[PDB]
Amino acid sequence: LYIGGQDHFYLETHCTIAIPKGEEGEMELFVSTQNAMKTQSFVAKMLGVPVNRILVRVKRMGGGFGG
């Protein structure tokens, strides 16, 4: 038996705004994510910066469904 995959098709696609603060590696991010913690960590690790420097903010998503 086989079962095909599936696209999330959340009506709102992936989207991120990133605001660099110019001080000490600080950045503030608005993102359509269900996982602001991992967003924050993955950004920090990409930058070579401590996690305390990165702020992620999540108002709402136009769908997520795990995607």
Partner 1 sequence: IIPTKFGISFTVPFLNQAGALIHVYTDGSVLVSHGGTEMGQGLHTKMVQVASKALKIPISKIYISET
Query: What is the contact surface with ligand XAX in residues (CB under 6 A)?
Result: 34, 63-66
Minimum distance, C-beta of residue 49 to partner 1, in the bound complex (Å): 9
The residue ranges of DSSP E strands in the chain, in sequence order, are: 16-20, 27-31, 54-57
Q: Between residues 55 and 61, which has the closer beta carbon with respect to partner 1? A: 55
Cα–Cα dist 52/31, whole Å: 18
Cα–Cα dist 47/66, whole Å: 26
34 annotated ligand binder: yes
Binder among 50, 62, 63, 67 for partner 1 (CB under 8 A): 50
